[PDB]
Write a protein that holds these residues in place. Sequence first.
Motif, PDB file in Angstrom:
ATOM      1  N   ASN A 285     -44.771  70.045  19.396  1.00  9.33           N
ATOM      2  CA  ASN A 285     -44.383  70.449  20.961  1.00  9.33           C
ATOM      3  C   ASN A 285     -43.667  71.127  20.984  1.00  9.33           C
ATOM      4  O   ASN A 285     -42.939  71.527  22.549  1.00  9.33           O
ATOM      5  N   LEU A 286     -43.411  72.906  20.425  1.00  5.91           N
ATOM      6  CA  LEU A 286     -43.404  74.005  20.421  1.00  5.91           C
ATOM      7  C   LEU A 286     -43.970  74.483  21.631  1.00  5.91           C
ATOM      8  O   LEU A 286     -45.299  75.119  20.533  1.00  5.91           O
ATOM      9  N   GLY A 287     -44.283  74.781  22.292  1.00  9.03           N
ATOM     10  CA  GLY A 287     -45.356  75.156  23.277  1.00  9.03           C
ATOM     11  C   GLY A 287     -44.430  75.786  24.983  1.00  9.03           C
ATOM     12  O   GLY A 287     -43.516  75.837  25.219  1.00  9.03           O
ATOM     13  N   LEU A 288     -46.251  75.344  25.274  1.00  8.81           N
ATOM     14  CA  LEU A 288     -45.641  76.568  27.213  1.00  8.81           C
ATOM     15  C   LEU A 288     -46.969  75.833  28.092  1.00  8.81           C
ATOM     16  O   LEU A 288     -47.967  75.552  27.555  1.00  8.81           O
ATOM     17  N   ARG A 289     -46.792  75.571  28.875  1.00  6.53           N
ATOM     18  CA  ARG A 289     -47.453  74.958  30.247  1.00  6.53           C
ATOM     19  C   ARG A 289     -47.800  76.513  30.374  1.00  6.53           C
ATOM     20  O   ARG A 289     -47.741  77.602  31.793  1.00  6.53           O
ATOM     21  N   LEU A 290     -49.892  76.643  30.683  1.00  9.20           N
ATOM     22  CA  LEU A 290     -50.417  78.313  30.743  1.00  9.20           C
ATOM     23  C   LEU A 290     -51.463  77.470  32.025  1.00  9.20           C
ATOM     24  O   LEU A 290     -52.015  78.678  32.428  1.00  9.20           O
ATOM     25  N   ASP A 291     -52.379  75.983  31.556  1.00 10.68           N
ATOM     26  CA  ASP A 291     -53.273  75.691  32.256  1.00 10.68           C
ATOM     27  C   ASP A 291     -52.681  75.620  33.628  1.00 10.68           C
ATOM     28  O   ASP A 291     -51.604  73.999  33.423  1.00 10.68           O
ATOM     29  N   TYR A 292     -52.508  75.372  34.821  1.00 10.92           N
ATOM     30  CA  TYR A 292     -53.216  74.547  36.214  1.00 10.92           C
ATOM     31  C   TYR A 292     -54.365  74.824  36.635  1.00 10.92           C
ATOM     32  O   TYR A 292     -55.148  75.492  36.757  1.00 10.92           O
ATOM     33  N   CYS A 293     -53.548  73.534  37.919  1.00  6.22           N
ATOM     34  CA  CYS A 293     -55.001  73.231  38.971  1.00  6.22           C
ATOM     35  C   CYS A 293     -54.318  73.641  40.059  1.00  6.22           C
ATOM     36  O   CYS A 293     -53.163  72.796  40.208  1.00  6.22           O
ATOM     37  N   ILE A 294     -54.266  74.605  41.302  1.00  6.61           N
ATOM     38  CA  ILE A 294     -53.280  75.022  41.998  1.00  6.61           C
ATOM     39  C   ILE A 294     -54.911  74.774  43.341  1.00  6.61           C
ATOM     40  O   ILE A 294     -55.794  74.583  43.395  1.00  6.61           O
ATOM     41  N   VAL A 295     -53.993  73.545  44.030  1.00  2.00           N
ATOM     42  CA  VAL A 295     -54.969  73.237  45.834  1.00  2.00           C
ATOM     43  C   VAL A 295     -54.037  73.978  46.791  1.00  2.00           C
ATOM     44  O   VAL A 295     -53.046  74.328  47.034  1.00  2.00           O
ATOM     45  N   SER A 296     -55.126  74.071  47.658  1.00  2.00           N
ATOM     46  CA  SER A 296     -54.443  74.718  48.904  1.00  2.00           C
ATOM     47  C   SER A 296     -53.918  73.439  49.860  1.00  2.00           C
ATOM     48  O   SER A 296     -54.188  72.492  49.467  1.00  2.00           O
ATOM     49  N   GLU A 297     -52.480  73.399  50.554  1.00  2.00           N
ATOM     50  CA  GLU A 297     -51.570  72.680  51.061  1.00  2.00           C
ATOM     51  C   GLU A 297     -52.786  71.948  52.158  1.00  2.00           C
ATOM     52  O   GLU A 297     -51.951  70.983  52.269  1.00  2.00           O
ATOM     53  N   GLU A 298     -53.672  72.534  51.942  1.00  4.59           N
ATOM     54  CA  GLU A 298     -54.293  71.089  53.137  1.00  4.59           C
ATOM     55  C   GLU A 298     -55.019  70.083  52.318  1.00  4.59           C
ATOM     56  O   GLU A 298     -55.895  69.301  52.712  1.00  4.59           O
ATOM     57  N   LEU A 299     -55.413  70.218  51.369  1.00  2.00           N
ATOM     58  CA  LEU A 299     -55.763  69.253  50.151  1.00  2.00           C
ATOM     59  C   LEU A 299     -55.044  68.148  49.384  1.00  2.00           C
ATOM     60  O   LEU A 299     -54.664  67.542  48.830  1.00  2.00           O
TER      61      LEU A 299
END
Length: 247
Positions: A207-221
């Motif tokens: 588990n020597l890793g990085l968080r590179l993947d995201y789901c980002i939402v507008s604040e309305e959601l």
Amino acid sequence: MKIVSWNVNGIRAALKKNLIDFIENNMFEVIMFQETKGDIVPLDFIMMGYEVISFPAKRKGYSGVMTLTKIKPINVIKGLQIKEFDDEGRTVTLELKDFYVINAAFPRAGDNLERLDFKLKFNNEIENFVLKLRRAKPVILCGDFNIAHQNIDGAFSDPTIPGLTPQERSWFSHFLSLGFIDTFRYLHPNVRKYSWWSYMGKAREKNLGLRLDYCIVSEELKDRIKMADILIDIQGSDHAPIILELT
């Protein structure tokens, strides 16, 4: 309602079973792939009832994006209308009723940072693209950002390492400040969990890793966010798939 994003650059040959089983064991409404190669063919998913939106890379040595959907889109937008990025097949957008859903493959800056300016220009172009869409409907932006935003995302900032540069991390902070929510970090403010590990050696096992993947939402959601996770047990690529579930 269930939205999945996965950089599948490693899915090939017998590893294709990992991806097919993953899709068939679940009921994902929207599935977004980055870095699609040969063993990922639209016929696989059309048979499952998915509409397949493909945006191949024209450029030699690059792999585009692909989006699978059980929700019929109102509109499909391939690319950002910027040739140096669209020729690498880096964004696919579906207009659904409640929001746009963007499948983005952000450029890696390079281990000699030889593509860093290219990455920072992509950041600004997708930022402007998102802000244009947001005038009409809220926006969900998922994919491989090739950025580890904060220390909890895998490493200290390092001006020599792609994905950890001050400029890449600063843009991510800026983008959130425009009214956007990192869904995994929102639901899990202090959970250290990664979505990428080197193919080489014992990195993923350790588990020597990085968080590179995201789901980002507008604040309305914001109040639609129900579940968010990284499915680190799903094998076959150096990235793990991520998931966002809405109400």
